[PDB]
């Protein structure tokens, strides 16, 4: 093995400088295979042959050799192999598909490498898999981020990754997940409502965003959430048969501008359901419509 | 005996009238008595007197009543109920017409209960529409003109929504110019009858049973697509369910309520009226939003004088789409405003409907019509898997009287005979059937165990007794309450810690307590002794699944032992919400007993979970050419991309034989076999004149220089039926094999698997059975053909009884041992080739691949290119032996005769070395996956080319299989007539879809739809829901084309003809006709088969010492005397076996065998003393059947059990029972009539053998005329044998 070490080192020193398509490369690789005939349990020479085959760039030969080497060594030393073959996934010219499958093989043995995976997907504009794995790890509640990100941090990441890539997640349940997260996010309810509304907007389902903002105003608890959500709704009405439609735009904008004191009063009371003085002012908000004042009394 | 008289009596109606004036229900208000009906129908009252002489000029109420009650009792008993009317249908239509008015009789004209029986007969007709004569009766009531029963606006909107129907509608009118409202008048009469019940000193049970039967009839109507197609809108306009909700019969605090729940689940099912397809969720949303929008528009246009209505109209759909919003926008309306809205603007009720003048009813109709309701998938996903006390005792759903289910009541259980709406409906019905069938056995287990507990008072509970099936829990508290998944409104996981005491261990009970493993089902039961629910005060019973046993260190791996068990989180969440809203107790702390049960008999909950996952799977991943076949609807079109040319190989032993097998197929023998005459193997090509097959002979590529390396061969001279079955299995599609008794199913199936392994080396075979013995026989036949044991494996949860182990650990052992041998072989190969460092090439598995390329292949290429240059030279060809580079390896070669010969020998030895290296590379997995379980996963997922298992194991393993990336292309299954529906459909989805379409290409199902069906613990589920009918039998019932195995080769033909009449052209093989082992008669009896009469025995015949324990001491004594006389004749006792059609006969027979013969040195014991159904597939030389029953014919009248118990013999059968009892039943007569063709007295020869079956015996044949003479004979004979 040390004799084999000298042999392999001398071979790799001797073929250093020749072209990749020389006989010498295959000869040194065959000598390395003859060495692994004896030393299947050797992580050192295995990583040596693996880095040398990386310098060969033989995707399929290095692939078969990696698949054989990881299985030939006990688990406790494949780590020194992972940081090797992982770097190979970062090497260009091989399929992204093989990288994805090898990542699925890796993250099933040590899942704490999750964020690295996410980065590569962000590094490929494959948002339909990035957001998918992010929502996966967003419900695997035991997961502990490697970069120190909060569950809320990856949550905002997945919110943005759904909203900006509303076409890319086709096949997934964005609506239910964002809703149940609004049942898990207590600090950004208005933000989540507005984000899901914009995600429904960017898919041409304006009525779905309008119903979203409706259930948001009917679901908000604090004044910030209803303020931000109704501000989004007013901007959406302002932005979204030509003359009749422009006048309907003006009419709904007038609607919501007449409405903002109404709803802001509503959430002022959502904050303090027994604040009688704000009830005084909100009763005065409804002068001219005495039915409203009787209802508010 | 009356119809066989020379002058048969002329048919007379006076006798019928006399019968009606009595024992017949007609004249009465009460329904006809069942015992009398049993006496009458079993007397063939319909098939012989009623139906054969029935006429319109003679028909009345009494005749139709007798016929309807007889048809009902015939369906209740599971006998043919249509053949008599199909034999003579000239009068079958007219009665049917007079049937409808009989159902359309007004109240007090004809008996109510008689009209309930009429409704039941009409339900059976609507459910038996597969018959043509019944089809001509159901068509005119189930056709398009049924829309002529609708309101004018109803049909107008119907033609406006789908305009293209209107044209055909006019055609109907045109067709008229040169029945439709039967269901509608029935529904109006049903609403009236219901209204005639007092909601709140009691009403008649007739009305309740009528409503329940009508709900069952409507359920069967709307569970079947073709009849519901146009009855759906008819029942919708009929507003029947809306009344059924706010009826008086409904609020009566049960059967009608559950059947109305079934009707509500069915009438809103997501199935398309004309398209017949399942509607998506977006379609449902669009339909609900459309109708709601229309309603809003109507309110805007018709309700402008009512502010609230206008506000509701102005609001979006989703705001007013709920029930709260519906109740919040109406009660402001006057009755005229509600009528204007509902009848004119929305048209939900015709202005001419008698109920269109009632305010509250109209409001209720409006509320029912408009509400966002959750889908069926949501309803299923919100269901528990385990029941509580509300279902455990209720015989309305889960049965008490269900063991004694007479057929007389309706039951709220969905039943499917030929198909379903779609796939999801079948899945829900099968899962519900499995749950409700397991429910009765769970009730039995709990009742017995908590009876054994002897629970008594103390506000405590003290146990006078103990149960090995139930231990009292000492501590019980839930520790794990997970948050819901998004969308889900229930817990994601509920576990609880439960600690109980060993108490008196008794070196067994304590060990059993430890037998808990993960997923095993236990139950926490809370009971309150008042002194079975009344007995021990059992209140709550909730089940759980132990996840792991916790050791004394807090890790989920004295006498106090604790477990973490996961309970039903959905039922738990329901109970929690109900506690929070209704202040109810938390039963999660009130449990005080924990009970577990058997591992084999506790598979229900896991199968429910798998059926639920199948109910949640995104797509119908089944091949679309099989969804319609499994649906029972559409042309099967799944029979055999037909591969024209396929390799049959070792199928035919001779070229001539292949031609002989198929009568319609021409022989074009292309002889490339190197022999003068055609020889195996052979290739057969099928055309696409055209009845010709092109046969190309082939030579198997040499496997090397070793003669023992030659591949094995199949040897069975398969007949044309077996050849056609293997051919259908060889081409893609559905193959249905109906194989008779001993017709060679296992051989043809193993040949099919071998041809699959051979013609397509990239495809695998999935083998699914019902039993482990079937897999044993399949593997015993597989090893007998050239199929690599490295490519076959069998999974199971047992005894290894073959020579080889196809278990996963057997695969691990084969892989490891062959890996060690292979490395040594490689090392030997190197050393001999003079390669330096020969240890380094064989040291590493990967290296061996480099040695193959550099040292083996490159020596072979130099050899071939040297031998070609030498052959060109004209030098002696021995040159192959001179140049061959592997001479020292193959020392443990070339003939020099011809160029091609030595080239083939060299190529073969090279392919041998290539196979050695390929097996090394294939076993590299065991050097890459250390753990044996990882190696099992690697074998099933990558290497295995035939993966075998059973139905229960496949159900348990579907989840983990689809998880572990399992793949398989073609599947074969035996016992296809004994596998429950879900158990045979399950093995199709043990893997995910590829590109969105199924990878399944061949579905081979072999069985006998004439043999015994699957097992049901509860005899009520077969009576009511017909759940024992298998999927293969249902397919064949629809008209699935099947190859009929018609060559029996294991039993005597004179014995075979006793049951071969149930099959198509099932004959006898050459050996059964020619082998003297079949022409040998039985010693000690003149005849090789005889029916033995058994009269009363001291005033006793069939007796029942216990409840339901039917035995016959006399026939048992006679069978024991026969077996003892045979064992005195020297017959091998273990070659003779005793079976019985009731377990009581087997128990009494065991007692008598252990009392009278037991300690004898001359007398042996039978092979098996067991049951007819407990002898399925088994065989002996001599069979002795006990027909103990004498008063009731019993379930031995079934054709399936008759065939089974008639084909359990190979050489000799002795059947002992009341002959007149069995002769009186027509269904078994075809067999029984044969048994009457010989004497009914025991014919023995106490002095004898080499006699022939037909030839005259050369000794005096003695006759025993009764069991007493048999006993005297056996006593005296044994006495004379003992002094010798």
Coordinates of N, CA, C and O in Angstrom, one line a residue, chain B residues 657-786:
Chain B
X657 N -45.1 -30.9 -33.2 CA -45.9 -30.6 -32.1 C -46.5 -29.2 -32.1 O -47.7 -29.0 -31.7
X658 N -45.7 -28.2 -32.4 CA -46.2 -26.9 -32.5 C -47.3 -26.7 -33.5 O -48.3 -26.0 -33.2
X659 N -47.2 -27.3 -34.6 CA -48.2 -27.3 -35.7 C -49.5 -27.9 -35.2 O -50.6 -27.5 -35.4
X660 N -49.3 -29.1 -34.5 CA -50.4 -29.8 -33.9 C -51.2 -29.1 -32.9 O -52.5 -29.2 -32.8
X661 N -50.6 -28.2 -32.1 CA -51.2 -27.5 -31.0 C -52.3 -26.5 -31.5 O -53.4 -26.4 -30.9
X662 N -52.0 -25.8 -32.6 CA -53.0 -24.9 -33.2 C -53.6 -25.4 -34.5 O -52.9 -25.5 -35.5
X663 N -54.9 -25.7 -34.5 CA -55.8 -26.2 -35.6 C -55.9 -25.1 -36.7 O -55.9 -25.5 -37.9
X664 N -56.1 -23.9 -36.4 CA -56.3 -22.8 -37.3 C -55.0 -22.1 -37.8 O -55.0 -21.2 -38.6
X665 N -53.9 -22.5 -37.2 CA -52.6 -21.9 -37.6 C -51.7 -22.8 -38.5 O -51.4 -23.9 -38.2
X666 N -51.4 -22.2 -39.7 CA -50.6 -22.9 -40.6 C -49.1 -23.1 -40.2 O -48.6 -22.3 -39.4
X667 N -48.5 -24.2 -40.6 CA -47.1 -24.5 -40.2 C -46.1 -24.2 -41.4 O -46.3 -24.8 -42.5
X668 N -45.2 -23.3 -41.2 CA -44.1 -22.9 -42.2 C -42.8 -23.1 -41.5 O -42.1 -22.0 -41.2
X669 N -42.4 -24.3 -41.2 CA -41.2 -24.7 -40.4 C -39.9 -24.3 -41.2 O -39.5 -25.0 -42.1
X670 N -39.2 -23.2 -40.7 CA -37.9 -22.9 -41.2 C -36.9 -23.6 -40.3 O -36.6 -23.1 -39.2
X671 N -36.4 -24.7 -40.7 CA -35.5 -25.6 -39.9 C -34.0 -25.1 -40.0 O -33.3 -25.3 -40.9
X672 N -33.6 -24.4 -38.9 CA -32.2 -24.0 -38.6 C -31.7 -24.7 -37.4 O -30.7 -24.2 -36.8
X673 N -32.3 -25.8 -37.0 CA -31.9 -26.5 -35.7 C -30.7 -27.4 -35.8 O -30.4 -28.1 -34.9
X674 N -30.1 -27.5 -37.0 CA -29.0 -28.4 -37.3 C -29.4 -29.9 -37.4 O -28.5 -30.7 -37.8
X675 N -30.6 -30.3 -37.1 CA -31.1 -31.7 -37.2 C -32.0 -31.8 -38.4 O -32.6 -30.9 -38.9
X676 N -32.2 -33.1 -38.9 CA -33.0 -33.4 -40.0 C -34.5 -33.0 -39.8 O -35.1 -32.4 -40.7
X677 N -35.0 -33.3 -38.6 CA -36.4 -32.9 -38.3 C -36.4 -31.7 -37.4 O -35.4 -31.3 -36.8
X678 N -37.6 -31.0 -37.3 CA -37.6 -29.8 -36.5 C -37.3 -30.1 -35.0 O -37.9 -31.1 -34.5
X679 N -36.5 -29.2 -34.3 CA -36.2 -29.4 -32.9 C -36.2 -28.1 -32.2 O -35.9 -27.1 -32.7
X680 N -36.5 -28.2 -30.9 CA -36.6 -27.0 -30.0 C -35.2 -26.4 -29.7 O -34.2 -27.1 -29.7
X681 N -35.2 -25.1 -29.6 CA -36.3 -24.2 -29.5 C -36.8 -23.8 -30.9 O -36.3 -24.2 -31.9
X682 N -37.9 -22.9 -30.9 CA -38.4 -22.5 -32.1 C -39.0 -21.1 -32.0 O -39.4 -20.6 -30.9
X683 N -39.1 -20.3 -33.1 CA -39.6 -19.0 -33.2 C -40.9 -18.9 -33.9 O -41.0 -19.4 -35.1
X684 N -42.0 -18.3 -33.3 CA -43.3 -18.2 -34.0 C -43.6 -16.8 -34.3 O -43.5 -15.9 -33.4
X685 N -44.1 -16.5 -35.5 CA -44.5 -15.2 -36.0 C -46.0 -15.1 -36.3 O -46.5 -16.0 -37.0
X686 N -46.7 -14.1 -35.8 CA -48.1 -14.0 -36.1 C -48.4 -12.8 -37.0 O -47.9 -11.7 -36.8
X687 N -49.2 -13.0 -38.0 CA -49.6 -12.1 -39.1 C -50.5 -11.0 -38.5 O -51.1 -11.1 -37.5
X688 N -50.6 -9.9 -39.3 CA -51.4 -8.7 -38.9 C -52.3 -8.4 -40.0 O -52.3 -9.0 -41.1
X689 N -54.9 -17.6 -45.7 CA -54.3 -16.3 -46.1 C -53.5 -15.7 -44.9 O -52.3 -15.8 -44.8
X690 N -54.3 -15.1 -44.0 CA -53.7 -14.5 -42.8 C -53.8 -15.4 -41.6 O -53.5 -15.0 -40.4
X691 N -54.1 -16.7 -41.8 CA -54.2 -17.7 -40.7 C -52.9 -18.5 -40.7 O -52.9 -19.7 -40.3
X692 N -51.8 -18.0 -41.3 CA -50.6 -18.7 -41.4 C -49.6 -18.1 -40.4 O -49.5 -16.8 -40.2
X693 N -48.8 -18.9 -39.8 CA -47.7 -18.5 -38.9 C -46.3 -18.9 -39.5 O -46.2 -20.1 -39.9
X694 N -45.4 -18.0 -39.5 CA -44.1 -18.2 -40.0 C -43.2 -18.7 -38.8 O -43.0 -17.9 -37.9
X695 N -42.6 -19.9 -39.0 CA -41.8 -20.4 -37.9 C -40.3 -20.4 -38.4 O -40.0 -21.0 -39.4
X696 N -39.5 -19.7 -37.7 CA -38.0 -19.7 -37.9 C -37.3 -20.4 -36.8 O -37.5 -20.0 -35.6
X697 N -36.6 -21.5 -37.1 CA -35.8 -22.2 -36.1 C -34.6 -21.4 -35.7 O -34.1 -20.6 -36.5
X698 N -34.1 -21.6 -34.5 CA -33.0 -20.8 -34.0 C -32.1 -21.8 -33.1 O -32.6 -22.8 -32.6
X699 N -30.9 -21.4 -32.9 CA -29.9 -22.1 -32.2 C -29.4 -21.3 -31.0 O -28.9 -20.2 -31.2
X700 N -29.5 -21.7 -29.8 CA -29.1 -20.9 -28.6 C -27.6 -20.6 -28.6 O -26.8 -21.6 -28.7
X701 N -27.2 -19.4 -28.6 CA -25.8 -19.0 -28.6 C -25.0 -19.8 -27.5 O -25.4 -19.7 -26.3
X702 N -24.0 -20.4 -27.9 CA -23.2 -21.3 -27.1 C -22.9 -20.6 -25.7 O -22.4 -19.5 -25.8
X703 N -23.1 -21.2 -24.6 CA -22.8 -20.6 -23.3 C -21.3 -20.9 -22.9 O -20.9 -20.5 -21.8
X704 N -20.6 -21.5 -23.8 CA -19.2 -21.8 -23.5 C -18.8 -23.2 -23.8 O -19.6 -24.0 -24.4
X705 N -17.6 -23.6 -23.3 CA -17.1 -25.0 -23.5 C -17.6 -26.1 -22.6 O -17.4 -27.2 -22.8
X706 N -18.3 -25.7 -21.5 CA -18.7 -26.7 -20.5 C -20.1 -27.3 -20.9 O -21.1 -26.5 -21.0
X707 N -20.2 -28.6 -21.1 CA -21.5 -29.2 -21.5 C -22.6 -29.0 -20.4 O -23.7 -28.8 -20.8
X708 N -22.2 -29.0 -19.1 CA -23.2 -28.8 -18.1 C -23.7 -27.4 -18.1 O -24.7 -27.1 -17.4
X709 N -23.1 -26.5 -18.8 CA -23.6 -25.1 -18.9 C -24.7 -24.9 -19.9 O -25.1 -23.8 -20.2
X710 N -25.2 -26.0 -20.4 CA -26.4 -26.0 -21.3 C -27.6 -25.6 -20.6 O -27.8 -26.0 -19.4
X711 N -28.5 -24.7 -21.2 CA -29.7 -24.3 -20.5 C -30.7 -25.4 -20.4 O -30.8 -26.3 -21.3
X712 N -31.5 -25.4 -19.3 CA -32.5 -26.4 -19.1 C -33.7 -26.1 -20.2 O -33.6 -25.2 -21.0
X713 N -34.7 -27.0 -20.1 CA -35.8 -26.9 -21.0 C -37.1 -27.3 -20.3 O -37.1 -28.1 -19.4
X714 N -38.1 -26.6 -20.7 CA -39.5 -27.1 -20.4 C -39.8 -28.3 -21.2 O -39.4 -28.5 -22.3
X715 N -40.5 -29.3 -20.5 CA -40.8 -30.6 -21.1 C -42.3 -30.8 -21.3 O -42.6 -31.9 -21.9
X716 N -43.1 -30.0 -20.8 CA -44.6 -30.2 -20.9 C -45.1 -30.1 -22.3 O -44.9 -29.0 -22.9
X717 N -45.7 -31.1 -22.8 CA -46.4 -31.1 -24.1 C -47.7 -30.3 -23.9 O -48.8 -30.8 -23.9
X718 N -47.5 -29.0 -23.8 CA -48.7 -28.1 -23.6 C -49.7 -28.2 -24.7 O -49.3 -28.1 -25.9
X719 N -50.9 -28.4 -24.4 CA -52.0 -28.5 -25.3 C -52.3 -27.1 -26.0 O -51.7 -26.1 -25.5
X720 N -53.2 -27.1 -27.0 CA -53.5 -25.8 -27.6 C -54.0 -24.8 -26.7 O -53.8 -23.6 -26.9
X721 N -54.7 -25.2 -25.6 CA -55.2 -24.2 -24.7 C -54.1 -23.6 -23.8 O -54.0 -22.4 -23.7
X722 N -53.2 -24.4 -23.4 CA -52.0 -23.9 -22.6 C -51.1 -23.1 -23.5 O -50.6 -22.1 -23.1
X723 N -50.9 -23.5 -24.8 CA -50.1 -22.8 -25.7 C -50.8 -21.4 -26.0 O -50.1 -20.4 -26.0
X724 N -52.1 -21.4 -26.2 CA -52.8 -20.1 -26.4 C -52.7 -19.2 -25.2 O -52.6 -18.0 -25.3
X725 N -52.8 -19.8 -24.0 CA -52.6 -19.0 -22.8 C -51.2 -18.4 -22.6 O -51.1 -17.2 -22.3
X726 N -50.2 -19.2 -22.9 CA -48.8 -18.6 -22.9 C -48.7 -17.6 -24.0 O -47.9 -16.6 -23.8
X727 N -49.3 -17.8 -25.1 CA -49.2 -16.8 -26.2 C -49.9 -15.5 -25.9 O -49.3 -14.4 -26.1
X728 N -51.0 -15.5 -25.2 CA -51.7 -14.3 -24.8 C -50.9 -13.6 -23.7 O -50.8 -12.4 -23.7
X729 N -50.3 -14.4 -22.8 CA -49.3 -13.8 -21.8 C -48.1 -13.2 -22.5 O -47.5 -12.3 -21.9
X730 N -47.7 -13.8 -23.6 CA -46.4 -13.3 -24.2 C -46.6 -12.0 -24.9 O -45.6 -11.2 -25.0
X731 N -47.8 -11.7 -25.4 CA -48.1 -10.4 -26.0 C -48.7 -9.4 -25.0 O -49.3 -9.8 -24.0
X732 N -48.5 -8.1 -25.2 CA -48.9 -7.1 -24.2 C -50.5 -7.1 -24.2 O -51.2 -7.3 -25.2
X733 N -51.0 -6.8 -23.0 CA -52.4 -6.7 -22.8 C -52.9 -7.6 -21.6 O -52.1 -8.0 -20.7
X734 N -54.2 -7.8 -21.5 CA -54.8 -8.5 -20.5 C -55.0 -10.0 -20.9 O -55.5 -10.3 -22.0
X735 N -54.5 -10.9 -20.0 CA -54.7 -12.3 -20.2 C -55.5 -12.9 -19.1 O -55.1 -12.7 -17.9
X736 N -56.6 -13.5 -19.4 CA -57.5 -14.1 -18.4 C -57.5 -15.6 -18.6 O -58.0 -16.1 -19.7
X737 N -57.0 -16.4 -17.6 CA -56.9 -17.8 -17.7 C -57.9 -18.5 -16.8 O -57.8 -18.2 -15.5
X738 N -58.8 -19.2 -17.3 CA -59.8 -20.0 -16.4 C -59.3 -21.4 -16.5 O -59.5 -22.1 -17.5
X739 N -58.6 -21.8 -15.4 CA -57.9 -23.1 -15.4 C -58.7 -24.1 -14.5 O -58.9 -23.9 -13.3
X740 N -59.1 -25.3 -15.1 CA -59.9 -26.2 -14.4 C -59.1 -27.0 -13.4 O -57.9 -26.7 -13.2
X741 N -59.7 -27.9 -12.7 CA -59.0 -28.7 -11.6 C -57.9 -29.6 -12.2 O -58.1 -30.4 -13.1
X742 N -56.6 -29.3 -11.8 CA -55.5 -30.1 -12.3 C -55.2 -29.9 -13.8 O -54.8 -30.9 -14.4
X743 N -55.5 -28.8 -14.4 CA -55.3 -28.6 -15.8 C -53.9 -28.0 -16.2 O -53.7 -27.7 -17.4
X744 N -53.1 -27.8 -15.2 CA -51.7 -27.4 -15.5 C -51.5 -25.8 -15.5 O -50.9 -25.3 -16.4
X745 N -52.1 -25.1 -14.6 CA -51.9 -23.7 -14.5 C -50.5 -23.3 -14.2 O -49.9 -22.4 -14.8
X746 N -49.9 -23.9 -13.2 CA -48.6 -23.5 -12.7 C -47.6 -23.7 -13.8 O -46.7 -22.8 -13.9
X747 N -47.7 -24.7 -14.6 CA -46.7 -25.0 -15.6 C -46.8 -23.9 -16.7 O -45.7 -23.3 -17.1
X748 N -48.0 -23.6 -17.2 CA -48.1 -22.5 -18.2 C -47.7 -21.2 -17.7 O -47.1 -20.4 -18.4
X749 N -48.0 -20.9 -16.4 CA -47.6 -19.6 -15.8 C -46.1 -19.5 -15.7 O -45.5 -18.4 -16.0
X750 N -45.4 -20.6 -15.2 CA -43.9 -20.5 -15.2 C -43.3 -20.4 -16.6 O -42.3 -19.7 -16.8
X751 N -44.0 -21.1 -17.6 CA -43.5 -20.9 -18.9 C -43.7 -19.5 -19.4 O -42.9 -19.0 -20.2
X752 N -44.8 -18.8 -19.0 CA -45.0 -17.4 -19.4 C -43.9 -16.6 -18.8 O -43.4 -15.7 -19.5
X753 N -43.6 -16.8 -17.5 CA -42.6 -16.0 -16.9 C -41.2 -16.2 -17.6 O -40.4 -15.3 -17.7
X754 N -40.9 -17.5 -18.0 CA -39.7 -17.8 -18.6 C -39.6 -17.1 -20.0 O -38.6 -16.6 -20.4
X755 N -40.7 -17.2 -20.8 CA -40.7 -16.5 -22.1 C -40.6 -15.0 -21.9 O -40.0 -14.3 -22.8
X756 N -41.1 -14.5 -20.8 CA -41.0 -13.0 -20.6 C -39.5 -12.7 -20.3 O -39.0 -11.7 -20.8
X757 N -38.9 -13.5 -19.4 CA -37.5 -13.3 -19.1 C -36.6 -13.4 -20.3 O -35.5 -12.8 -20.5
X758 N -37.0 -14.3 -21.3 CA -36.2 -14.6 -22.4 C -36.3 -13.6 -23.6 O -35.3 -13.0 -24.1
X759 N -37.6 -13.3 -24.0 CA -37.8 -12.5 -25.1 C -37.4 -11.0 -24.8 O -37.0 -10.3 -25.7
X760 N -37.6 -10.6 -23.6 CA -37.3 -9.2 -23.2 C -36.5 -9.3 -21.9 O -37.0 -9.3 -20.8
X761 N -35.1 -9.2 -22.1 CA -34.2 -9.2 -20.9 C -34.3 -8.0 -20.1 O -33.8 -8.0 -18.9
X762 N -34.9 -6.9 -20.6 CA -35.1 -5.7 -19.8 C -36.3 -5.5 -19.0 O -36.4 -4.6 -18.2
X763 N -37.3 -6.4 -19.3 CA -38.6 -6.4 -18.5 C -38.5 -7.4 -17.4 O -37.8 -8.4 -17.4
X764 N -39.3 -7.1 -16.3 CA -39.4 -7.9 -15.1 C -40.8 -8.4 -14.9 O -41.7 -7.9 -15.6
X765 N -40.9 -9.4 -14.1 CA -42.2 -10.1 -13.8 C -42.6 -9.9 -12.4 O -41.8 -10.3 -11.5
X766 N -43.7 -9.3 -12.1 CA -44.3 -9.2 -10.8 C -45.3 -10.3 -10.5 O -46.3 -10.3 -11.2
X767 N -45.0 -11.1 -9.5 CA -45.8 -12.3 -9.2 C -46.6 -12.1 -7.9 O -46.0 -11.9 -6.9
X768 N -47.9 -12.1 -8.0 CA -48.8 -11.9 -6.9 C -49.7 -13.0 -6.7 O -50.4 -13.5 -7.6
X769 N -49.8 -13.6 -5.4 CA -50.6 -14.7 -5.1 C -51.5 -14.5 -4.0 O -51.7 -13.3 -3.5
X770 N -52.3 -15.5 -3.6 CA -53.1 -15.5 -2.4 C -52.4 -16.3 -1.2 O -52.7 -15.9 -0.1
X771 N -51.6 -17.3 -1.6 CA -51.0 -18.1 -0.6 C -49.5 -18.3 -0.8 O -49.0 -17.9 -1.9
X772 N -48.8 -18.7 0.2 CA -47.4 -19.0 0.1 C -47.1 -20.3 -0.6 O -46.0 -20.4 -1.2
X773 N -48.0 -21.3 -0.4 CA -47.8 -22.6 -1.1 C -47.8 -22.4 -2.6 O -47.1 -23.1 -3.4
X774 N -48.6 -21.4 -3.1 CA -48.6 -21.2 -4.6 C -47.3 -20.6 -5.0 O -46.8 -21.0 -6.1
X775 N -46.7 -19.7 -4.3 CA -45.4 -19.3 -4.6 C -44.3 -20.4 -4.5 O -43.4 -20.4 -5.3
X776 N -44.5 -21.3 -3.6 CA -43.6 -22.4 -3.5 C -43.7 -23.3 -4.8 O -42.6 -23.6 -5.3
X777 N -44.9 -23.6 -5.2 CA -45.0 -24.4 -6.5 C -44.5 -23.6 -7.7 O -43.8 -24.2 -8.5
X778 N -44.7 -22.3 -7.7 CA -44.3 -21.5 -8.8 C -42.7 -21.5 -8.9 O -42.1 -21.6 -10.0
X779 N -42.1 -21.4 -7.7 CA -40.6 -21.4 -7.7 C -40.1 -22.8 -8.0 O -39.0 -22.9 -8.6
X780 N -40.8 -23.8 -7.5 CA -40.3 -25.2 -7.9 C -40.4 -25.4 -9.4 O -39.6 -26.2 -9.9
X781 N -41.4 -24.8 -10.0 CA -41.4 -24.9 -11.5 C -40.4 -24.0 -12.2 O -40.0 -24.3 -13.3
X782 N -40.1 -22.9 -11.6 CA -39.2 -21.9 -12.1 C -37.8 -22.4 -12.1 O -37.0 -22.3 -13.1
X783 N -37.4 -23.1 -11.0 CA -36.1 -23.7 -10.9 C -35.9 -24.8 -12.0 O -34.7 -25.1 -12.3
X784 N -37.0 -25.4 -12.4 CA -36.9 -26.5 -13.4 C -36.7 -26.0 -14.8 O -36.5 -26.9 -15.7
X785 N -36.7 -24.7 -15.1 CA -36.3 -24.1 -16.4 C -35.1 -23.2 -16.2 O -34.8 -22.8 -15.1
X786 N -34.5 -22.9 -17.3 CA -33.2 -22.2 -17.3 C -33.6 -20.7 -17.1 O -33.8 -19.9 -18.0

